[PDB]
Amino acid sequence: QNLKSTDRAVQQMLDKAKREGIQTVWDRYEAMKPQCGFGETGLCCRHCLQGPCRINPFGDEPKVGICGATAEVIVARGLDRSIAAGAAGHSGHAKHLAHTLKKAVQGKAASYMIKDRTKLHSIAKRLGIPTEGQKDEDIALEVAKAALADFHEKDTPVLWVTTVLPPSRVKVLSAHGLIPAGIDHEIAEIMHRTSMGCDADAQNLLLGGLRCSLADLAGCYMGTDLADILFGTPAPVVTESNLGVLKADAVNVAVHGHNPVLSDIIVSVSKEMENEARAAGATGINVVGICCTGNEVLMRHGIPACTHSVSQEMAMITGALDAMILDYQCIQPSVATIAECTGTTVITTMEMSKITGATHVNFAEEAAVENAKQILRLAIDTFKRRKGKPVEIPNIKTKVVAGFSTEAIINALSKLNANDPLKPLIDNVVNGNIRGVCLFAGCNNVKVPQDQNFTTIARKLLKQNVLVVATGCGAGALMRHGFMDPANVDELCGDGLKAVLTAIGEANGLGGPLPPVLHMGSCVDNSRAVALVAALANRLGVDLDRLPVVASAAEAMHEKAVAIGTWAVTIGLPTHIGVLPPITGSLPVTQILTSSVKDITGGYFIVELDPETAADKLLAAINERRAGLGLPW
Amino acid sequence: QNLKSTDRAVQQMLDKAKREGIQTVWDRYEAMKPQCGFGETGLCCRHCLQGPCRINPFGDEPKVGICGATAEVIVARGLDRSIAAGAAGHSGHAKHLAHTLKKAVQGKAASYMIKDRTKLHSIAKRLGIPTEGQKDEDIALEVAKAALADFHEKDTPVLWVTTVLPPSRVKVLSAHGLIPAGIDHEIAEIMHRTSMGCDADAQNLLLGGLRCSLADLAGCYMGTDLADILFGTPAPVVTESNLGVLKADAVNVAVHGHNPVLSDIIVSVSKEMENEARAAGATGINVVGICCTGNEVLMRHGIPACTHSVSQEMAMITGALDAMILDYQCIQPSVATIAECTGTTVITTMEMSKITGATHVNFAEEAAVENAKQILRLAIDTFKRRKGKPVEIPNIKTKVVAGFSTEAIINALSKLNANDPLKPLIDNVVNGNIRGVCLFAGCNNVKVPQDQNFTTIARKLLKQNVLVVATGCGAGALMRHGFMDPANVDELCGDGLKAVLTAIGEANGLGGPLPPVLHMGSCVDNSRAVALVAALANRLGVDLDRLPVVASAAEAMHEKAVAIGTWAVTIGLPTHIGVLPPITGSLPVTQILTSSVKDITGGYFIVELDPETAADKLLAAINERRAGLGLPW
Ligand code: SF4
Ligand code: SF4
Ligand code: FES
Ligand code: FES
Ligand SMILES: [Fe+2]
Ligand SMILES: [Fe+2]
Ligand SMILES: [Fe+3]
Ligand SMILES: [Fe+3]
Ligand SMILES: [Fe+3]
Ligand SMILES: [Fe+3]
Ligand SMILES: [Fe+3]
Ligand SMILES: [Fe+3]
Ligand SMILES: [Fe+3]
Ligand SMILES: [Fe+3]
Ligand SMILES: [Fe+3]
Ligand SMILES: [Fe+3]
Ligand SMILES: [S]
Ligand SMILES: [S]
Ligand SMILES: [S]
Ligand SMILES: [S]
C-alpha cells in the first residue's frame, strides 16, 4: 500500500477497503491501465463530429487531423480548453461569493455580514472605490458590483488583474495583449477559438491561453478577497490533521469541496447544536475538513483537516463519517456509491453539482442557518444508526500551525521591523539565510504515490534554506506529514532558515519558531502568494521575473491546477509541474511553454516527474534569480 | 470519387488533386481509419491529468472513470462542453457585431451604418427600448448595449431568448430552470460543472446543456438581428452556385468563414476597384462565397456561392482562386498549406483566428475600407502571377433563388392575404397541400458522402408535400444540387406543394413558382426559422411542440451544429441528426435525448444514419403532429 500512498493512515484504510471489497480510486486506476498514449501526449482531438482524430507521436499516419489541424494546434487547443475550464471553476466560486456579499449588505441574507471591515476598505481603495463618508454596506455593494463587472467587457480591463500586479508587470503583459478583458469573456473566447476551423497557430493559441490564465488568477484573487471580507482574514491558528481527527463518540461531519459559503455556516451552527447531538448520545458535532473547503475553515477557525484529494474516500472507510457535505470541485463521485457501504450520508448543496444517489439539500444564503440545521440533523440521525457498530479510525494525526495569510505574514515580520515589515525577509534573502521562496500548489494525482513528490521536493528545498509556502492539497500533503509542526524545524530546516523561522516566531510570542512550511490557505488563496510576491517586487523596485521565487504543482490533477501553473508562468515564475501535462506530443508547444515563453513573460514551466531532479531544477532556478540580482548562492 | 462527394464539380477537382499529389480532407480521413471507438461513443474523458479515462462500451474493465465518473456522466459532460463551444462561436460572432454597431453609431467606423431602420425599430420595440422621439443612433446604441448585457448576469434573463419565443414556451422552459441567465455566464458554468469532481448526475448535466443551448440560440438570434440592422434584411435574390462561378479571366476572391463584418465591405470595395483590376489584365474582381460568410453575402447581395464545408479545398485546386479571405469558424487549416501548391493567397483577418503560414491583415472596423483595399491588392498581385497558367474550373453551376428571410416569407405570403399573411400558409397545412415544415441545417461531414443525406431526405420530403427551408451548409448542399432553382419544382415537388409554391410565386410577379427549397441564410439565421415558427405558433395559439415542424442536421460536424440541434429540441422540435453524436456509449443519456426529453420540452432527437429511414422518421414525426392537431395526414 505504500506504493499507493505515503500516508500511513491512508495505507491502513486501503487495507480495510481491500478486505471489505470496496473499490477505491487506486483500484479504478489499475483497471484503466494501460492508458491511451494519444490522450496522454495531447495528440487526440474530439472538437468535431468528424473525429476522433489522433496523431501518432512517432512513425507513420495518422500525422495530421482530418481538417488539417497539426499536432501543435491540437495540443495547444486542448491545453487552452483546460485553462478555460480551470478559470471557470475558480471564477464561478468567486462569482458565487460576490452574489453572497451583495445579498448580505442588501439585507437579504442575515447569516452573512461584513466580518473584516479593514479588508473591505483596503480592497475598495485598491479598486478606486471611494470610502470617505460612505457606509460600509454601500462600499461593499460597490465592491461586489465591481467583482461582477470583471466577468464581462467594460471600459476597463479586469481590475482583479491590473490592480493586483505591479505596474511594470501589467505593462509587460499589456504589450503582448495578455490582460484579460473580462473573466467569462475570455473563457468563451477560448472555447470559440479552439473550436473547429478557428485558431490554428500554436503561438497565437498559447497567447490566448496565457490571457485566460490571468482570468483564472483574477477569479482566485477575487475569491480570496470576498471570502476574507465575509468570513475574516486568516491569522495564525493551531489545529490537527489526518484521519485521527475523527472521533468515534462524536457526530463526524466532513465539509468537502471549495466554496465555504455554506460550510463556514456549518461550523458556527454545529456549535449551537451540541446539546441536540448530546441528546442523541454523541459528545458533540465534530466538523472536519476535506480538500479546499476544509482548508478554508482550517485557516479561519482551526477546524481539523481529515484528508485531501486522492485519499478522500478513505475518511468514509473508517465507518465513523456520519455526513459528507459537498459543494463543488474535486469531489470524487465514487463517494455517492461508497456511502451505501459505509453508512455515510453524502449531501450535495449546489444546483450545478449533483451526484446520482446522494441526498440534495437546496442551499440558499437566505436560509443558510435552516439549511445547515436540516443537514446536521441528517448527520445526527446517521450517528444514531451506527450505535454499536465498530469503527476503525487510524490513531494518526499531526499538529498543524496554519493561518498564514499575507496580512498575517506581514504582521509577523513587522515584529522585527515595524515600519518596513518586508525588509527583515529581504535582508535574509540577501545574506543567504533564506535562499528563495517556493510555493507548493495543486492536487494529489493517482499516478504519483500520494504526497511523495511534495515531501521529497520540500525536504530538499528546506535543507537548502528555501522559505516554503503552500496552498490547497499541497498544503494538505505537507500538513499530514508534519511540515506544519514547529517541533520539526530542527530536523527539516537548514540552519539559516531555522534562524529566521525562530527569530520571527519568538518575536511573535510563540516561544518557538514558525513552522517549517507556511500554510497560505486554499487554492484560490494562491492569490495570497501573488500578493506577497508582488509586495516584495514593489518593495525592491523590480518585476516578479527577477525575484528568487518559484512554484511547484508537484502532483497536479485538476484543470484548475493547469490554469494556476499557467498564470504562475505568466506573472513571471519558474513553475514546476510534477505530472505530465498533455503537451509532449508537440515539441514546438513544449518548447514554447518551457523555453521561449521566458522571452515573453520571464516565467517558464519546468516539467519533471522525478522529484529529486525537480528539486535540483527548482534550486537552479532560484539560484539563477539570485545571481541575476548580484547575490551569492 | 462519387463515394467521397455527390457533387460532380467536387469529383472533378478530387481527380485533379489526386493526379497532382495534393492531399485532401478525404485523404486525411482515410489515413485516420479506423477511428477510436471510445471517442466515437463518447466513452473517453480527459478532464483531468489522471486521465485519459476510457470505458469499454461492452465487456470487462475499464467500466468507470478513475474518479468514479460513470459512462452516463462522462457522456453528458462531453456533450455539454460541445454545446458550450458552439454557443461560444455563435455568440462570439454576435458580440463582434454588437461592438461594430456601437462603433458605427458613435461615429467611430464610418464604413458601417444603420442600413435597416425598420428592423432597428422593431428590435427595439421587442426589447422594450423606447423609440418615440429618439434619434436612430441613440436607439441603436441602446440595442447594442442590450445585446452586450445579455452576455452576463443582470436583473433580467437573456432577452434574446425570452423576447423571441412565445410566452407559453418561456413558461415551460422557466419551470424547468432552462432560461439562460447570461450567454457567457452559461458557457462558463458549463465548463465549471463539467470539470473534475463537480456535476455527476446525467439529468442535471443535460438540463444544464439544454439551458446552454438556449444561450446559443440567443447568440444566433442576436447575430441575425444585428447583421440585418447593419447590412440589410435579405429579400429574394437570384444568383448561382458551385465552382463554375469562378472565372479564369477575373480576380477570384473567396470570402470564407462566418462573420460578414469585413466581407460585406469586401463586396462593396471590390466594385470600386474594378478599373484597378482591369489595369492588371483582369475583367474585374469576382467575389465568391464559401461557407456561411458566403451565405451572408449571397442572401444580401446575390454574391455567387463557390462551395461549402467539406469541399472547401476544391476551390483552390482549380488554380484560379487568387485569394481566400478568412474570418473564423469552419475553415479547414489545410488551406494554408494547400495554398503553397495552388498559388492562392490565404489571408486571416481576426486576432483570435490565425493559421500558420497564412498572411494576416489586422482588420479594424475603423479602417475597414483601407483594410479591404490592402487585401484586394494582394489578390490582384496574385492574379498577375498566374498569367498564362492553365486553370481547371469545372463548368458546373446551378441557378439559385435565395433571400428568404422571415420578413421576406411573410411579405410573399401577404400577396395572398394582406392583413393575415400567415393564414394562407396555415390554410394549406390544414388542407394537406403542405404536410409540414422541415428545416435542414448544419454542415457536411467527411464520414458521409458529401450532400447525400441532405438531398436524399429532401427529395422524399418534397414529394410528400413538405415545405423545406434550409440554412448554412444544408442550404449549400441543396443549392449546389438544384433545389433552389424554380425550374426543378415540377420534378421535385408533390402536387400540393407545387400548387402552393406556384400561387405564392405568381402572386409576387415571378411568373413562376418559388423554388423547391427556401434558403433562410447562414447558420446564425437558423434564428429566422425560429422567428417564423414562433410566429406560426402565436397565430395558432399553440406552443411549438404542437406544430408539424421538424429539423434535420443531416450531415452535422461542428460543435455549433450540436448546440443548434440541442436548442431545436429545447424549443420543442423533433430534430434529426444524421451522423452519430458521441452519446451511444450511454443508453441512459441516449434515452433522455431521444425520448424522455419529450416530457420536458416536447422536442426530441432522432438519431438516424440511413437517410431514407431518416426521411420516414421525420415524416412520421410531422404526421404525429398533424394528428395531434386533429388534421388528416
Ligand atoms: S477539429 Fe479537426 S482534428 Fe479535431 S476532430 Fe474535428 S477534424 Fe479532427
Ligand atoms: S475527470 Fe475522472 S474520468 Fe475524467 S480524466 Fe479525470 S479521473 Fe478520468
Ligand atoms: S484516442 Fe485515446 S484519448 Fe482520444
Ligand atoms: S481513448 Fe480515443 S478518444 Fe480517448
Ligand atoms: Fe481544491
Ligand atoms: Fe457555418
Ligand atoms: Fe483538493
Ligand atoms: Fe482539487
Ligand atoms: Fe486540486
Ligand atoms: Fe486540492
Ligand atoms: Fe486545487
Ligand atoms: Fe460551413
Ligand atoms: Fe460550419
Ligand atoms: Fe457547419
Ligand atoms: Fe457550414
Ligand atoms: Fe453551421
Ligand atoms: S480543488
Ligand atoms: S488545484
Ligand atoms: S459554420
Ligand atoms: S453549424
PDB file of all heavy atoms in Angstrom, chain A residues 258 330 443 557-558 560, ligand 8:
ATOM      1  N   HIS A 258     -15.022  23.304  -2.277  1.00  0.00           N
ATOM      2  CA  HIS A 258     -14.189  24.504  -2.365  1.00  0.00           C
ATOM      3  C   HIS A 258     -14.782  25.777  -1.798  1.00  0.00           C
ATOM      4  O   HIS A 258     -14.058  26.569  -1.184  1.00  0.00           O
ATOM      5  CB  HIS A 258     -13.729  24.744  -3.799  1.00  0.00           C
ATOM      6  CG  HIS A 258     -12.665  23.795  -4.196  1.00  0.00           C
ATOM      7  ND1 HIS A 258     -12.914  22.451  -4.365  1.00  0.00           N
ATOM      8  CD2 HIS A 258     -11.340  23.966  -4.385  1.00  0.00           C
ATOM      9  CE1 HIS A 258     -11.789  21.836  -4.664  1.00  0.00           C
ATOM     10  NE2 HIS A 258     -10.820  22.729  -4.682  1.00  0.00           N
ATOM     11  N   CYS A 330     -13.481  18.796  -7.270  1.00  0.00           N
ATOM     12  CA  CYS A 330     -12.516  17.852  -6.715  1.00  0.00           C
ATOM     13  C   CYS A 330     -13.155  16.776  -5.854  1.00  0.00           C
ATOM     14  O   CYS A 330     -12.445  16.067  -5.147  1.00  0.00           O
ATOM     15  CB  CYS A 330     -11.390  18.590  -5.974  1.00  0.00           C
ATOM     16  SG  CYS A 330     -10.580  19.774  -7.092  1.00  0.00           S
ATOM     17  N   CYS A 443      -2.902  19.577  -6.496  1.00  0.00           N
ATOM     18  CA  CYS A 443      -3.636  18.396  -6.075  1.00  0.00           C
ATOM     19  C   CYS A 443      -2.645  17.281  -5.714  1.00  0.00           C
ATOM     20  O   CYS A 443      -1.429  17.463  -5.797  1.00  0.00           O
ATOM     21  CB  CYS A 443      -4.451  17.945  -7.308  1.00  0.00           C
ATOM     22  SG  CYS A 443      -5.036  19.341  -8.383  1.00  0.00           S
ATOM     23  N   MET A 557      -3.476  17.622 -10.828  1.00  0.00           N
ATOM     24  CA  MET A 557      -4.561  16.810 -11.379  1.00  0.00           C
ATOM     25  C   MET A 557      -5.592  17.652 -12.124  1.00  0.00           C
ATOM     26  O   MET A 557      -5.893  17.408 -13.285  1.00  0.00           O
ATOM     27  CB  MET A 557      -5.253  16.032 -10.243  1.00  0.00           C
ATOM     28  CG  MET A 557      -6.438  15.160 -10.628  1.00  0.00           C
ATOM     29  SD  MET A 557      -8.036  15.983 -10.469  1.00  0.00           S
ATOM     30  CE  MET A 557      -8.102  16.285  -8.708  1.00  0.00           C
ATOM     31  N   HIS A 558      -6.167  18.622 -11.451  1.00  0.00           N
ATOM     32  CA  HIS A 558      -7.355  19.290 -11.962  1.00  0.00           C
ATOM     33  C   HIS A 558      -7.021  20.322 -13.034  1.00  0.00           C
ATOM     34  O   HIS A 558      -5.910  20.868 -13.095  1.00  0.00           O
ATOM     35  CB  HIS A 558      -8.086  19.973 -10.800  1.00  0.00           C
ATOM     36  CG  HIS A 558      -9.527  20.240 -11.041  1.00  0.00           C
ATOM     37  ND1 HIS A 558      -9.968  21.360 -11.712  1.00  0.00           N
ATOM     38  CD2 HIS A 558     -10.628  19.567 -10.651  1.00  0.00           C
ATOM     39  CE1 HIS A 558     -11.296  21.326 -11.778  1.00  0.00           C
ATOM     40  NE2 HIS A 558     -11.713  20.238 -11.145  1.00  0.00           N
ATOM     41  N   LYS A 560      -8.056  23.195 -12.929  1.00  0.00           N
ATOM     42  CA  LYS A 560      -7.678  24.356 -12.124  1.00  0.00           C
ATOM     43  C   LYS A 560      -6.178  24.458 -11.899  1.00  0.00           C
ATOM     44  O   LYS A 560      -5.633  25.568 -11.866  1.00  0.00           O
ATOM     45  CB  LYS A 560      -8.370  24.290 -10.760  1.00  0.00           C
ATOM     46  CG  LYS A 560      -9.820  24.706 -10.799  1.00  0.00           C
ATOM     47  CD  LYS A 560     -10.502  24.609  -9.440  1.00  0.00           C
ATOM     48  CE  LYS A 560     -10.612  23.194  -8.965  1.00  0.00           C
ATOM     49  NZ  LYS A 560     -10.730  23.176  -7.480  1.00  0.00           N
TER      50      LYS A 560
HETATM   51 FE    FE C   8      -8.594  19.912  -6.252  1.00  0.00          FE
END
